[PDB]
Symmetry: C3
Subunit: 543 residues, 3 copies
């Protein structure tokens, strides 16, 4: 059965790769353990906090925390849906602490970031058409969403090498404290939705699961742990500084939008489908019904500022230098076809440049239905983009706009949805646009790193096998757990105990509404700590 | 230089070199892919391939792959293969030496072990060629072209490549494969001549594996985890695994039993296997009979059918349910009709009724004068994955006080037999979860209890798998290099058996799904010690 | 018992080092060989002790003008003809562009960084001499090396020597999909490769270097339509791979259709069907004009069924003007080697065509198509349809349709179709010296390659090394020399086809890649040595 040339080609110490001594491991028994928590409503703005205390003589070690949430049935009228990954967006903060203090904590967004390359984790936290499409209730008793459980993997450093990295409790009490975002963050809804009643009646219903380990004659040794912390820059300020950086493993930079100067209302939302094209199509779809109207004489029901034009016989309406081709089939003899030529329009001066959403269409074809008295659109040529779909409606009607701005029908305006997702990066719903033009990191007062493209994000996505990375400077390339991490290391004497970030943002057109979306600079630092287990668990910052 | 002046600036302790390694020399060996045709036997007269590996120059092996030749399929009717056809072929696999069975597995259990291996699943046969339902129009028409599929037979010997490989100490290994009846892998309609197919079909297998020829092999013993399952009785919420002495893991799930039906179904989506795909195939098969454009009252439907003309406002009220039907370009001599009771079920006369027509809220379309048919544009409905998983015979069983299936004979004859051996839950996606609570008892004591599938969450999480099972894992130690950690019995105290009780969700007797029977499946992973003194042997740890 | 602690471990203090991401600009010379662009980067910093993780970035220019233009998917990898890492002792490692790509083909994120977006890869159309077809863009190419397998452990040590990374770029026509209207002559003149090299450098305090091994791939391409290839001086190989490439030299490299960014088999097929449909069913007032004379365009009968021999095409268009009829083009593409032979007729691969004529746009809007078009059909060069072998005219499409055909010169195509789906190797034989080392009647070696590497684009691969990398000396197939076993010879038998299918005339080339084991030593700087 072997070929003759192999057997013919077949003193030195030789390591055996066909057998190995199956070592007896530490004696232990694992258990999936679940805890109800205690819910308090204080800290801050009466924010909801869950606390779980872990102390059992048979739990010697734990890891792999997973948080459960019961989502209630949602009944009533209006449009309602959950943000994708709803269970993660719920989370404002997680702390693991002993009686000596805090062992490890994370900001909601950073936990989410760390799990973003984990499709399973993401799926478990709630990503489904059931949960994330925008349902509409038609009756005060109609069911919008059914009840549901979501599961949030609270990834910890204790999970890297399973039992080797687990958290050893000894005889100490470990408290896990979870702070929840306000339910407004996790919910997408329209004006008809009675959010006021929903807000009062909604309660967070959490449960903390984990893998406990009952361990005979546990042999503890000291370990190291990376604890993340982040600094949020002042609004639109292109700088932030992290103080007291003594032994850090990595440093990440990114941008968030800030929508406080707005009502957080958006024209459209794609629902469960989350691709860039989904976002764009959802937006086109919402505009199409005011964009091309089939009507008995001039269309009614629009603001006087609307400029609705009858389409010439050759199908071309000319909006300044923009040509829009409109051919609708099966149009009644008493009716004509109209193009709305300024459905949304923005400018900071009269008689200057204009951002006009209607000029972003070049062809609209479709067929009229006599049966349902509507136009069924077939093919659209346009240049709508992910930004357009990310513009809050408030910006269209702002005092900086010389135009009325929002010339949609009332019916369309009613369909607008509030979106308060807490984990948005960049300035568009997909973090597609790169608004950072240059990044500088200084250790003390000396330049540590500088780049003119996102070469650090490319390396981040590569080394972590992620397609949603960040501009990240990684200092630790040493394998976790089995080594002490490599860290950038302070002088303190020479002033080098702080990392300072300066980015150059690219500047947008002041006549595009996107210019007025506020930006925030997020800098996340991972500091090395030593873990000791001598009478209670404790950590110690490495200097 | 290019190294910034800060990194250079801040640069006698005992250190590990992370910038070089000692290249230690491995065992001198040489690998080879080997294929074998083996021998076939047919003794319910199930086919059994057996392959003997006897060669003094093969020290070890792993990575078994079984290939199967699928023959050309000629004739009339509708015919496709079940997704991942290769795995559904396999009833049982066993690896034995002269000293008995070294490792064996049920077909469904090997499928489950491979379910997160996309490549393995794709090689086994997942393609529109294989899995879309084709239709033959003449007795000499070709329905399916000859294909060859490859089934990766995952074994404990692959976990750590050469370290885990099954060693052969001059012993004769026999790999024995038991095949499900070909009924199980074929989705067909009534017009297909399955009788002739069933007798003409022959499983044509070849077993390949990676053999290793090793000089001066140095054998050591290892351990192996051998799966075992129990199936509770029909509709019992309990099942028990006896003789549990050293288990590494326990998993619980549910299968449906359709033995009380014909295993015929109204619709099937073919190669496209998403939940939305199943639903859409179903809505599509119903729509032919649901909304009819006709010259006077539509004909060819049973008398029990309630087909009514759509009023000029487009709304038909089926009891409390309002259906909107508006069709464009309908001829002046024709009207739009709606079948208000396409499928309907009830257990007591003039009481509660489940009526599939009521799960439509809006149906829009345009009549084609050129093809004499209605082309539908938008359907608002509430059909779900369960509706698509109902055997037709349940619509027409004696419990139904109605006729039940009010479809056209044209619709009825397109129904399909599905006999997939590996269905789970009570719907084709395994979406619906009918376990409301699960209890595992080691003896009289409760070992585990959960109120939601947190055990499946961990299973999926810890194995990176989208389709896990409610699984209790006892071993968190790395395989091969460590004696697996087990849960250990106490025979003295009756603690040598694992009993599982679940609380099934309570369903409505006026929904056909209520009558789909279910079985509890409990799989236990028993720890065995593999010994190599005079041949290969295994011993169940006690 | 004596038990190993699985609940805690000693934290070893590692070598003291600091890593830095380092980007460099290169020297570009358009010398070597056919005036091919070369980019040289010199790493000569005394404080860069080790490096790995090479990333090449490319600034792609704005593209202005007229016509249809797009970039091949994963454009950055397709740009690379060859990468070579060398030192003042010669070459340490080097790879051919296709093999680098092959090595990265299951690294989705690497592929995405290289340029795989609708911005890049859909075919765009410029409407005026100053219309912008593509915006400027920067892509990132992960030059994977043996030095990244085990991070700092596997890293390239510089040892106070001067490292030079050399990148040879394919001509830009390889990465561009264009029509005839696009001014490629000008573009070809003005386009310049604008490359920057990044890498992770390591400042190591008191580095303790040791020797190691390294697999260096090398390949042999057979002559056109010759089913054999030999690799010489094979003394210590860790693997051997066999695949097939098409040769399109007998050809203008033009194809009827291309799907764009969407790259699924079904996308290729639908893009094709859409292109044929404009000529396949025609709503016309009187017999359609503008077609070649060899075209057999017939009016669809009232029954709706047109019969092309034993092939029936059902065609119903809705809402057709009273003064026009519906026609079917019964031989849009046809191929036969004799007058009394089997004919391959693309119209016969359609069974049903429905749609609706639009009065407003005066064009037919197709609704549903029953057809049997396959991936091969879409991968047939137009030339082969009109080759001398074809006793028919071949291409009976409209002139408007033929204007839209696209040049494609992607250097990394394999097999004979655009998804490498069809296997054309029927039998495979591998000989070490004169003795058969391996043979197979089915693609079991490729099934294993896909299985063992978790890949759906594998190759027929003989793996000799099943030993963990870096931490052990790799297991190799080992020469004898005295018994003539210093040669790896591959012979394939290609599967046979009916000679009346155009794809039979696609020229094939056999590709054999051998991974030879090298020893890395660090005496007078870095040095590699071929194991014998
Ligand atoms: C998966 O097994 C391994 C991976 C990496 C390192 C080691 C090691 N140090 C000892 C034993 N096994 C190892």
């Amino acid at each position: 059965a072997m070929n003759n040339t192999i057997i013919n080609s077949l003193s030195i110490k030789r390591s055996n790769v066909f057998a190995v001594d199956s070592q007896i491991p530490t004696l232990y028994m694992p258990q999936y353990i679940s805890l109800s928590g205690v819910m308090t409503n204080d800290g801050p703005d009466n924010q909801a906090i869950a606390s779980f205390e872990i102390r059992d003589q048979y739990i010697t070690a734990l890891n792999h925390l997973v948080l459960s949430l019961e989502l209630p049935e949602v009944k009533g009228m209006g449009r309602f849906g959950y943000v994708p990954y709803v269970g993660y967006k719920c989370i404002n903060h997680v702390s693991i602490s002993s009686c000596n203090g805090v062992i490890w904590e994370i900001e909601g967004e950073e936990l989410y970031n760390n799990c973003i390359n984990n499709t399973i984790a993401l799926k478990h936290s709630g990503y489904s058409s059931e949960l994330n499409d925008i349902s509409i209730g038609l009756t005060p008793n109609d069911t919008i969403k059914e009840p549901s459980t979501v599961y949030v993997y609270i990834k910890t450093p204790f999970d890297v090498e399973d039992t080797f990295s687990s958290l050893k409790l000894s005889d100490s009490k470990i408290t896990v404290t979870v702070t929840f975002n306000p339910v407004s963050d996790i919910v997408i809804r329209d004006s008809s939705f009675d959010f006021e009643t929903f807000n009062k009646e909604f309660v967070y219903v959490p449960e903390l699961s984990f893998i406990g380990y009952m361990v005979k004659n546990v042999q503890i040794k000291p370990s190291f742990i990376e604890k993340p912390r982040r600094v949020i820059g002042q609004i639109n300020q292109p700088t932030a500084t992290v103080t007291e950086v003594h032994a850090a493993t990595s440093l990440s930079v990114y941008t968030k939008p800030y929508y406080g100067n707005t009502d957080n209302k958006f024209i459209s939302y794609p629902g469960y489908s989350q691709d860039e094209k989904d976002y764009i199509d959802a937006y086109v779809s919402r505009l199409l019904d005011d964009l091309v109207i089939v009507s008995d004489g001039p269309p009614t029901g629009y603001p006087e500022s609307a400029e609705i034009v009858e389409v010439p016989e050759d199908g071309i309406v000319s909006i300044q230098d923009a040509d829009v081709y409109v051919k609708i089939d099966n149009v009644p003899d008493n009716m004509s076809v109209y193009l709305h030529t300024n459905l949304l329009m923005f400018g900071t001066r009269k008689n200057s440049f204009i951002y006009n959403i209607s000029k972003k269409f070049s062809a609209i074809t479709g067929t009229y239905s006599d049966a349902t008295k509507r136009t069924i659109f077939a093919h659209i040529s346009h240049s709508i983009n992910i930004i357009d779909t990310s513009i809050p409606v408030s910006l269209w009607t702002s005092q900086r706009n010389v135009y009325n701005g929002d010339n949609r029908s009332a019916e369309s305006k009613a369909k607008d949805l509030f979106i308060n997702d807490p984990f948005i990066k960049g300035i568009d719903f997909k973090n597609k646009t790169d608004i950072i033009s240059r990044l500088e990191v200084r250790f003390g007062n000396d330049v540590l790193y500088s780049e003119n493209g996102p070469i650090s994000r490319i390396y981040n996505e590569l080394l972590t096998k992620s397609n949603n990375g960040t501009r990240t400077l990684t200092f630790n390339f040493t394998p976790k757990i089995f080594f002490r991490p490599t860290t950038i290391t302070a002088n303190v004497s020479r002033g080098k105990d702080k990392l300072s970030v300066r980015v150059v943002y690219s500047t947008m057109d002041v006549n595009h509404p996107i210019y007025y979306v506020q930006k925030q600079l997020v800098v996340v630092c991972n500091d090395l700590y030593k873990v000791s287990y001598d009478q209670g668990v404790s950590i110690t910052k490495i200097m």
